[PDB]
Amino acid sequence: PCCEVITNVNLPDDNVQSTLSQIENAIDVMLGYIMSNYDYQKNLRFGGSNEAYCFVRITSINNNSALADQITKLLVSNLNVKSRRIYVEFRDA
Amino acid sequence: PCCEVITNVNLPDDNVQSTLSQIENAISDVMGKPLGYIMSNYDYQKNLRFGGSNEAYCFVRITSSNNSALADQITKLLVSNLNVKSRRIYVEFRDNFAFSGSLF
Amino acid sequence: PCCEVITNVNLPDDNVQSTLSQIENAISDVKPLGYIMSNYDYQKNLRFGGSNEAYCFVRITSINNSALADQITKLLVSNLNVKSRRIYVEFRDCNFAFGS
Ligand SMILES: Cc1cc(Oc2cccc(O)c2)cc(-c2ccccc2)n1
């Protein structure tokens, strides 16, 4: 279980932790053993543009739409980013 | 696609953005892959090492032949814009379900 | 050859470089070290188990892996003052590279 949010959107730590906690909760869909991270990369681009954007890699779920949807709400609401600027990737020690 | 530049070389944001723009152009030109459809990123890791040494260095992951023309063209840009030695630039071509958030 | 340590544990640079040098030695002991990258990526908001307490993810790409894993887990436990229960080690065997 691993979720990483990669984004040029800067949030305060209290708010990052809230968002990550909400995603872990999401990731009901399929625990105590799980990584999540919020990686701030100001210079991150998509579509030739450096304005607000979120890449999310989720590893290890097959269900997947319910997760993606739920996550896309969380990020759109907590990060005040346009949903057309969110990409969600699944990969399926 | 995704291009990520991973480097202990610190550049100002105006310069980072230029450099990334030049690479996207490169990928786009040399590979004929769709423009706008690419992530690029510049990840600053001051403690990044290669060869036992923390001197200036660039790792470039390209994710998802012509390939040398790209690698070459990128290696100029980084050497020129980052003022780094070309002997300290490694270019890695690297290889599931995907979604946009507008579908929701 | 690439080792990346991903952790919310903040260390001073002198100490980070030390730790990375010790790992390269490990990876080397268990080819030689001129053909390798290592990095220590500080992500303060990194969580595991629903908790932001000290933790280490290590990706090691392109290399008896147990000898490596064990030896690195000692280094990180010692140098980062972190609980071994909070350290996970991944190997990847994921394709070419091209300056000098
Ligand atoms: C169709 C496609 C495009 C792709 O390039 C990207 C990756 C991230 C964002 C993006 O806009 C394109 C990567 C992938 C991909 C991602 C992970 C593993 C294998 C392929 N697949």
Short mmCIF file of all heavy atoms in Angstrom, two decimals, chain A residues 9-54, unseen atoms left out:
data_model
loop_
_atom_site.label_atom_id
_atom_site.label_comp_id
_atom_site.label_asym_id
_atom_site.label_seq_id
_atom_site.Cartn_x
_atom_site.Cartn_y
_atom_site.Cartn_z
N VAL A 9 1.14 22.75 -5.78
CA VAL A 9 0.30 23.43 -4.83
C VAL A 9 0.86 23.33 -3.42
O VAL A 9 1.03 22.22 -2.89
CB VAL A 9 -1.10 22.81 -4.81
CG1 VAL A 9 -2.00 23.59 -3.85
CG2 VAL A 9 -1.70 22.77 -6.20
N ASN A 10 1.16 24.48 -2.82
CA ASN A 10 1.72 24.51 -1.47
C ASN A 10 0.61 24.61 -0.44
O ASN A 10 -0.16 25.55 -0.45
CB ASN A 10 2.68 25.71 -1.31
CG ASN A 10 3.74 25.51 -0.22
OD1 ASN A 10 3.84 24.46 0.44
ND2 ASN A 10 4.56 26.50 -0.06
N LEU A 11 0.55 23.62 0.46
CA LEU A 11 -0.34 23.63 1.62
C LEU A 11 0.45 23.64 2.95
O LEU A 11 1.53 23.06 3.04
CB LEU A 11 -1.25 22.39 1.62
CG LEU A 11 -2.56 22.37 0.84
CD1 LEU A 11 -3.17 20.98 1.01
CD2 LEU A 11 -3.53 23.46 1.31
N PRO A 12 -0.13 24.26 4.00
CA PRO A 12 0.43 24.15 5.35
C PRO A 12 0.37 22.71 5.86
O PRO A 12 -0.49 21.93 5.44
CB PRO A 12 -0.48 25.05 6.19
CG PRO A 12 -1.26 25.86 5.22
CD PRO A 12 -1.38 25.04 3.99
N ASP A 13 1.29 22.35 6.76
CA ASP A 13 1.43 20.97 7.22
C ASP A 13 0.17 20.38 7.82
O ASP A 13 -0.14 19.23 7.56
CB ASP A 13 2.58 20.87 8.23
CG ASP A 13 3.94 21.06 7.59
OD1 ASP A 13 4.03 20.92 6.34
OD2 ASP A 13 4.90 21.33 8.35
N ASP A 14 -0.54 21.15 8.64
CA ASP A 14 -1.79 20.69 9.27
C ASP A 14 -2.76 20.22 8.20
O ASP A 14 -3.37 19.17 8.34
CB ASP A 14 -2.43 21.80 10.14
N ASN A 15 -2.87 21.00 7.11
CA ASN A 15 -3.76 20.68 5.97
C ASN A 15 -3.26 19.49 5.11
O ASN A 15 -4.05 18.66 4.68
CB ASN A 15 -4.03 21.93 5.13
N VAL A 16 -1.96 19.40 4.88
CA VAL A 16 -1.38 18.24 4.19
C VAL A 16 -1.75 16.96 4.93
O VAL A 16 -2.19 15.98 4.34
CB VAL A 16 0.15 18.39 4.07
CG1 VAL A 16 0.82 17.06 3.75
CG2 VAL A 16 0.51 19.42 3.00
N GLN A 17 -1.53 16.96 6.24
CA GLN A 17 -1.74 15.76 7.04
C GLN A 17 -3.19 15.38 7.02
O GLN A 17 -3.51 14.19 6.94
CB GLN A 17 -1.27 16.00 8.48
CG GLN A 17 0.23 16.14 8.61
CD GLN A 17 0.98 14.87 8.29
OE1 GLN A 17 1.74 14.82 7.34
NE2 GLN A 17 0.78 13.83 9.10
N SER A 18 -4.08 16.36 7.04
CA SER A 18 -5.51 16.09 6.94
C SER A 18 -5.85 15.37 5.63
O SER A 18 -6.56 14.37 5.63
CB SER A 18 -6.31 17.39 7.08
OG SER A 18 -6.15 17.95 8.36
N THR A 19 -5.34 15.90 4.52
CA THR A 19 -5.58 15.34 3.20
C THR A 19 -5.05 13.94 3.01
O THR A 19 -5.75 13.09 2.51
CB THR A 19 -4.91 16.22 2.13
OG1 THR A 19 -5.13 17.60 2.43
CG2 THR A 19 -5.48 15.89 0.76
N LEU A 20 -3.83 13.72 3.48
CA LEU A 20 -3.24 12.39 3.43
C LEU A 20 -4.03 11.39 4.29
O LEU A 20 -4.28 10.25 3.84
CB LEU A 20 -1.78 12.43 3.86
CG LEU A 20 -0.80 13.19 2.93
CD1 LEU A 20 0.62 13.06 3.49
CD2 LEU A 20 -0.85 12.71 1.50
N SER A 21 -4.46 11.81 5.49
CA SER A 21 -5.28 10.97 6.34
C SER A 21 -6.58 10.58 5.65
O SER A 21 -6.99 9.42 5.67
CB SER A 21 -5.57 11.69 7.64
OG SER A 21 -6.13 10.80 8.59
N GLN A 22 -7.22 11.54 4.98
CA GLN A 22 -8.43 11.25 4.22
C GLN A 22 -8.26 10.26 3.07
O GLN A 22 -9.16 9.46 2.78
CB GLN A 22 -9.03 12.54 3.68
CG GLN A 22 -9.65 13.32 4.82
CD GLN A 22 -10.64 14.40 4.39
OE1 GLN A 22 -10.49 15.03 3.35
NE2 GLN A 22 -11.66 14.61 5.20
N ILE A 23 -7.11 10.32 2.42
CA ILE A 23 -6.81 9.41 1.32
C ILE A 23 -6.55 8.00 1.84
O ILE A 23 -7.03 7.02 1.25
CB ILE A 23 -5.61 9.90 0.47
CG1 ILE A 23 -5.95 11.25 -0.20
CG2 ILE A 23 -5.26 8.87 -0.60
CD1 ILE A 23 -4.76 11.96 -0.78
N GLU A 24 -5.79 7.89 2.92
CA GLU A 24 -5.51 6.58 3.52
C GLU A 24 -6.81 5.91 3.87
O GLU A 24 -6.98 4.72 3.61
CB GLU A 24 -4.67 6.70 4.78
CG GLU A 24 -3.23 7.06 4.50
CD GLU A 24 -2.55 7.64 5.71
OE1 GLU A 24 -3.21 7.74 6.76
OE2 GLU A 24 -1.37 8.02 5.61
N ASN A 25 -7.71 6.68 4.47
CA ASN A 25 -9.04 6.20 4.77
C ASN A 25 -9.66 5.65 3.50
O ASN A 25 -10.10 4.50 3.48
CB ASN A 25 -9.89 7.32 5.37
CG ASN A 25 -9.47 7.70 6.78
OD1 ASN A 25 -8.58 7.10 7.36
ND2 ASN A 25 -10.12 8.70 7.33
N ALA A 26 -9.65 6.45 2.44
CA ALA A 26 -10.15 5.99 1.13
C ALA A 26 -9.46 4.66 0.67
O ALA A 26 -10.14 3.66 0.45
CB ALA A 26 -10.00 7.10 0.09
N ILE A 27 -8.13 4.69 0.56
CA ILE A 27 -7.28 3.53 0.22
C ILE A 27 -7.25 2.57 1.38
O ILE A 27 -8.28 2.01 1.72
CB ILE A 27 -5.83 3.93 -0.19
N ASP A 28 -11.44 2.29 3.30
CA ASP A 28 -12.49 1.29 3.09
C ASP A 28 -12.17 0.50 1.83
O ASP A 28 -12.17 -0.72 1.86
CB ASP A 28 -13.90 1.90 2.99
N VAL A 29 -11.86 1.20 0.74
CA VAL A 29 -11.90 0.58 -0.59
C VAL A 29 -11.04 -0.70 -0.75
O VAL A 29 -11.45 -1.62 -1.46
CB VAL A 29 -11.60 1.64 -1.69
CG1 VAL A 29 -11.55 1.03 -3.09
CG2 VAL A 29 -12.65 2.75 -1.68
N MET A 30 -9.89 -0.79 -0.08
CA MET A 30 -9.07 -2.05 -0.13
C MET A 30 -8.04 -2.19 0.98
O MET A 30 -8.31 -1.88 2.13
CB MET A 30 -8.34 -2.16 -1.48
N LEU A 31 -6.11 0.70 6.52
CA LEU A 31 -5.25 -0.28 7.18
C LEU A 31 -4.19 0.41 8.04
O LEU A 31 -4.11 1.64 8.08
CB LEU A 31 -4.58 -1.19 6.15
N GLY A 32 -3.38 -0.39 8.72
CA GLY A 32 -2.33 0.14 9.58
C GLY A 32 -1.00 0.17 8.85
O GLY A 32 -0.11 0.94 9.19
N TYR A 33 -0.87 -0.69 7.83
CA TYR A 33 0.34 -0.75 7.03
C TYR A 33 0.13 -0.05 5.69
O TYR A 33 -0.43 -0.62 4.76
CB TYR A 33 0.75 -2.21 6.80
N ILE A 34 0.59 1.20 5.61
CA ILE A 34 0.43 2.01 4.40
C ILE A 34 1.32 3.24 4.42
O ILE A 34 1.36 3.91 5.43
CB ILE A 34 -1.05 2.46 4.24
N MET A 35 2.02 3.53 3.31
CA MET A 35 2.71 4.81 3.06
C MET A 35 1.78 5.79 2.34
O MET A 35 1.02 5.41 1.44
CB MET A 35 3.90 4.66 2.11
CG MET A 35 5.20 4.19 2.70
SD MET A 35 6.48 4.31 1.40
CE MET A 35 7.06 5.98 1.49
N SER A 36 1.85 7.05 2.73
CA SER A 36 1.33 8.13 1.91
C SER A 36 2.32 9.26 1.95
O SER A 36 3.08 9.38 2.92
CB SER A 36 -0.05 8.62 2.38
OG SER A 36 -0.02 9.14 3.68
N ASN A 37 2.38 10.07 0.90
CA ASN A 37 3.23 11.25 0.93
C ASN A 37 2.70 12.36 0.07
O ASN A 37 2.06 12.12 -0.94
CB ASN A 37 4.68 10.91 0.54
CG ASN A 37 5.62 12.09 0.71
OD1 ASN A 37 5.57 12.83 1.69
ND2 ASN A 37 6.47 12.28 -0.27
N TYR A 38 3.01 13.59 0.49
CA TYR A 38 2.69 14.79 -0.24
C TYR A 38 4.01 15.45 -0.58
O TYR A 38 4.67 16.02 0.29
CB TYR A 38 1.82 15.70 0.64
CG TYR A 38 1.23 16.94 -0.02
CD1 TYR A 38 -0.11 16.99 -0.37
CD2 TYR A 38 2.00 18.06 -0.24
CE1 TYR A 38 -0.67 18.12 -0.95
CE2 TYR A 38 1.46 19.20 -0.81
CZ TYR A 38 0.13 19.22 -1.16
OH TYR A 38 -0.38 20.36 -1.75
N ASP A 39 4.40 15.35 -1.85
CA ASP A 39 5.66 15.89 -2.34
C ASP A 39 5.44 17.23 -3.07
O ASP A 39 4.92 17.27 -4.21
CB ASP A 39 6.31 14.84 -3.27
CG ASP A 39 7.81 15.09 -3.56
OD1 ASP A 39 8.43 15.96 -2.92
OD2 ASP A 39 8.35 14.40 -4.43
N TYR A 40 5.88 18.31 -2.43
CA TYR A 40 5.79 19.65 -3.02
C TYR A 40 6.93 19.96 -4.04
O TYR A 40 8.10 20.14 -3.68
CB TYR A 40 5.72 20.69 -1.91
CG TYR A 40 5.72 22.13 -2.35
CD1 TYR A 40 4.73 22.63 -3.21
CD2 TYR A 40 6.72 23.03 -1.89
CE1 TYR A 40 4.74 23.96 -3.61
CE2 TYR A 40 6.73 24.36 -2.28
CZ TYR A 40 5.73 24.82 -3.13
OH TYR A 40 5.75 26.13 -3.51
N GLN A 41 6.55 20.01 -5.32
CA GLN A 41 7.45 20.39 -6.41
C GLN A 41 6.93 21.64 -7.14
O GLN A 41 6.20 21.50 -8.12
CB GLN A 41 7.56 19.25 -7.43
CG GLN A 41 7.97 17.91 -6.85
CD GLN A 41 9.37 17.93 -6.30
OE1 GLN A 41 10.29 18.50 -6.89
NE2 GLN A 41 9.55 17.31 -5.17
N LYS A 42 7.31 22.83 -6.69
CA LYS A 42 6.82 24.05 -7.28
C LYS A 42 6.93 24.05 -8.78
O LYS A 42 6.05 24.51 -9.46
CB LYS A 42 7.58 25.24 -6.71
N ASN A 43 8.00 23.51 -9.31
CA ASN A 43 8.26 23.62 -10.71
C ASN A 43 7.66 22.58 -11.57
O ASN A 43 7.99 22.42 -12.68
CB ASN A 43 9.73 23.58 -10.92
CG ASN A 43 10.42 24.71 -10.27
OD1 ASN A 43 10.45 25.80 -10.78
ND2 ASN A 43 10.94 24.46 -9.11
N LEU A 44 6.76 21.84 -11.00
CA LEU A 44 6.05 20.81 -11.68
C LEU A 44 5.17 21.46 -12.76
O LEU A 44 4.42 22.42 -12.50
CB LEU A 44 5.20 19.99 -10.65
CG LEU A 44 4.34 18.83 -11.20
CD1 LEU A 44 5.23 17.70 -11.73
CD2 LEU A 44 3.35 18.33 -10.17
N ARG A 45 5.22 20.89 -13.96
CA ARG A 45 4.40 21.32 -15.09
C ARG A 45 3.49 20.20 -15.64
O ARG A 45 3.79 19.02 -15.51
CB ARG A 45 5.31 21.84 -16.23
CG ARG A 45 6.22 22.98 -15.84
CD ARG A 45 7.34 23.14 -16.83
NE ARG A 45 6.81 23.46 -18.16
CZ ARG A 45 6.80 24.68 -18.72
NH1 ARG A 45 7.31 25.72 -18.09
NH2 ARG A 45 6.29 24.85 -19.92
N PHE A 46 2.39 20.62 -16.25
CA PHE A 46 1.57 19.75 -17.09
C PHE A 46 0.88 20.58 -18.16
O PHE A 46 0.44 21.70 -17.89
CB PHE A 46 0.53 18.97 -16.29
CG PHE A 46 -0.41 18.17 -17.13
CD1 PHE A 46 -0.08 16.90 -17.55
CD2 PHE A 46 -1.65 18.70 -17.52
CE1 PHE A 46 -0.95 16.16 -18.34
CE2 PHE A 46 -2.53 17.97 -18.32
CZ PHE A 46 -2.17 16.69 -18.72
N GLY A 47 0.84 20.04 -19.38
CA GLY A 47 0.25 20.77 -20.51
C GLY A 47 0.98 22.02 -20.93
O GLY A 47 0.36 22.92 -21.48
N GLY A 48 2.29 22.05 -20.70
CA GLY A 48 3.10 23.23 -20.93
C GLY A 48 2.95 24.35 -19.91
O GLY A 48 3.47 25.44 -20.13
N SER A 49 2.31 24.07 -18.78
CA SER A 49 1.92 25.10 -17.82
C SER A 49 2.25 24.71 -16.37
O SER A 49 2.01 23.58 -15.96
CB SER A 49 0.42 25.37 -17.97
OG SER A 49 -0.11 26.15 -16.93
N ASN A 50 2.76 25.68 -15.60
CA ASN A 50 3.13 25.50 -14.20
C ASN A 50 2.01 25.90 -13.21
O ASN A 50 2.24 26.06 -12.01
CB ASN A 50 4.39 26.30 -13.93
CG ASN A 50 4.84 26.26 -12.47
OD1 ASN A 50 5.26 25.22 -11.95
ND2 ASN A 50 4.73 27.38 -11.81
N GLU A 51 0.78 25.95 -13.65
CA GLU A 51 -0.25 26.31 -12.72
C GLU A 51 -0.76 25.06 -12.10
O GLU A 51 -0.47 24.01 -12.55
CB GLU A 51 -1.37 27.12 -13.34
CG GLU A 51 -2.46 27.48 -12.35
CD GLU A 51 -2.19 28.72 -11.52
OE1 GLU A 51 -2.40 29.82 -12.04
OE2 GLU A 51 -1.84 28.58 -10.35
N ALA A 52 -1.51 25.23 -11.02
CA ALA A 52 -1.78 24.17 -10.04
C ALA A 52 -2.16 22.85 -10.70
O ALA A 52 -2.97 22.83 -11.62
CB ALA A 52 -2.86 24.61 -9.07
N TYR A 53 -1.56 21.77 -10.20
CA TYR A 53 -1.71 20.42 -10.77
C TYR A 53 -1.31 19.31 -9.76
O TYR A 53 -0.47 19.52 -8.90
CB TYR A 53 -0.88 20.34 -12.07
CG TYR A 53 -0.81 18.98 -12.71
CD1 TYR A 53 -1.84 18.50 -13.53
CD2 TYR A 53 0.29 18.16 -12.51
CE1 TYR A 53 -1.77 17.23 -14.10
CE2 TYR A 53 0.37 16.89 -13.07
CZ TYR A 53 -0.66 16.43 -13.86
OH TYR A 53 -0.55 15.19 -14.43
N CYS A 54 -1.95 18.14 -9.87
CA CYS A 54 -1.76 17.02 -8.96
C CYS A 54 -1.55 15.72 -9.69
O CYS A 54 -2.44 15.26 -10.42
CB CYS A 54 -2.99 16.83 -8.07
SG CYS A 54 -2.97 17.81 -6.57
#
